Design a protein around this nucleic acid. Structure first.
Ligand SMILES: [Zn+2]
Ligand SMILES: [Zn+2]
Ligand SMILES: [Zn+2]
Ligand SMILES: [Zn+2]
Ligand SMILES: [Zn+2]
Length: 146
DNA sequence: CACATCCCATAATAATG
DNA sequence: CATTATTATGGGATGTG
């Protein structure tokens, strides 16, 4: 009755043998799929990730928005699915805070919103020490330094 | 500068051939 | 063994107030 990870602090259990094999590779950092483009040298855990990474070198964007007048092209279906919400107005990711009730178009936009309630500032400036809500805010303060 | 917002890319999960 | 699909994740870039 195996398929429980046995590394020291993990205590996780799996269902599919391939997902189990993936998990073990992350513990070992076993990245056997290497990008052959000159000067890149990045590596990945599975062949699928290398194939998607290649689109950063050959410019393929196979997923197109069919909104009239838009025709924008994206490297993953998931990104196109997010983009389409600017034409549909769908905001399916809802803030479950007590009195907020705000919705968002992207899952990650909700993540960046939850720090407004928690009040945390996870992004730090390595020079001065100021603390920022988002990384982009930290970077425009870095452009003020240099 | 704090945000929401739209764009970009990889990690992890899940299931199938 | 292998491939495919979708979600989860999070940084980059920007325009408003
Ligand atoms: Zn583990
Ligand atoms: Zn590469
Ligand atoms: Zn569009
Ligand atoms: Zn909220
Ligand atoms: Zn600073």
């Amino acid at each position: 009755k195996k398929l429980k990870c046995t590394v020291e602090g993990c205590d996780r259990t799996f269902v599919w043998p391939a997902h189990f094999k993936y998990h073990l590779k992350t513990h070992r950092n076993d990245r056997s799929f290497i990008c052959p483009a000159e000067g890149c040298g990045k590596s990945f855990y599975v062949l699928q990730r290398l194939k998607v990474h290649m689109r950063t070198h050959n410019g393929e964007k196979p997923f197109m928005c069919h909104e009239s007048g838009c025709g924008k092209q994206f490297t993953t279906a998931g990104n196109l699915k997010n983009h389409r919400r600017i034409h549909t107005g769908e905001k399916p990711f809802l803030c479950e805070a007590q009195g907020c009730g705000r919705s968002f178009a992207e899952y990650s936009s909700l993540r960046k919103h939850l720090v407004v309630h928690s009040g945390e500032k996870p992004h730090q400036c390595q020079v001065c020490g100021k603390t920022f809500s988002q990384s982009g805010s930290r970077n425009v303060h870095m452009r003020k330094h240099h």
